[PDB]
Design a protein that fits this description.
monomer, 159 residues, mainly beta, Lipocalin, 8-stranded antiparallel beta barrel, 9 strands, 47% strand, globular, lipid metabolism, signal, prostaglandin metabolism, golgi apparatus, fatty acid biosynthesis
Length: 159
């Protein structure tokens, strides 16, 4: 479930949100109309992570921050969303720290319990073929179909 021997300090820093797969068509569609700028992973006071995402929305730069509280094994987190009335499990399932990370999220409480999402984070804004295939292979193994896998538009604005 989690990356074996996960070391949080090496997962810190700048990542690019390069791909996502979800069983929510709404989320996929909304995300694709955004243009992703950098994400930043920083240490949180609670021992977990602050995940800060920057993106273009209708030509405006927007930033959103999510607190990833430590959940179970190292590399697993919980995200509580008052708006969605739900809590989500967020796990770093595989990473080499210096090129890519694969994240998997699903609801653990509330109406969001059926929500599922896989995320490709890349240290480079354009991940090479090997990294894209690691992501698609993971998505397929997890039951995401081809048309639910989205490579996300990027932008060099907002930074």
């Amino acid at each position: 479930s989690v990356q074996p021997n996960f070391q949080q300090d090496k997962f810190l820093g700048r990542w690019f949100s390069a791909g996502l797969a979800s069983n929510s068509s709404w989320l996929r569609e909304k995300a694709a109309a955004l243009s992703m700028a950098k994400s930043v992973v920083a240490p949180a006071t609670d021992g977990g992570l602050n995940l800060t995402s920057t993106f273009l929305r209708k030509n405006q730069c927007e930033t959103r921050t999510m607190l990833l509280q430590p959940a179970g094994s190292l590399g697993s987190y919980s995200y509580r969303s008052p708006h969605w009335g739900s809590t989500y499990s967020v796990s770093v399932v595989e990473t080499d720290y210096d090129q890519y990370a694969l994240l998997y999220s699903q609801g653990s409480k509330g109406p969001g319990e059926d929500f599922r999402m896989a995320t490709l984070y890349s240290r480079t804004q354009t991940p090479r073929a090997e990294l894209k295939e690691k992501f698609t292979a993971f998505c397929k193994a997890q039951g995401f179909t081809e048309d639910t896998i989205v490579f996300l538009p990027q932008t060099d604005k907002c930074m």
